[PDB]
């Protein structure tokens, strides 16, 4: 369970930085989105 | 505002993160926690 919950909040906050680089294009706002992109890919490969 | 929140956002991930790390001790856990710390720098500079 914990692990879902950090799935969780990696997609809460993927949704939130895509907001935030629509309203200003600060490209160090894409070089955390691509991080976070890989939080999730990890994450979900502990879920298996 | 919406930076503030996103900074806030990482905090509560390192927590969590780290009590994470705490109970199964995967590296993988590890790595994202720095990613998130370097998050958490990237926006304090834009900030105050
Ligand atoms: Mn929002
Ligand atoms: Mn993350
Ligand atoms: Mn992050």
Redesign the interface.
């Known amino acids: 369970d ?2 879902r ?2 799935l969780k ?2 997609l ?2 993927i949704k ?2 895509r ?2 680089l629509e ?1 200003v294009k ?1 490209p ?1 706002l894409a ?2 989105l691509e ?1 976070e992109e ?2 999730i890919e ?1 994450l979900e490969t ?1 879920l298996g």
């Open positions: 914990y692990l919950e950090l909040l990696e809460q906050a939130q930085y907001e935030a309203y600060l160090v070089k955390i991080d890989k939080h990890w502990i």
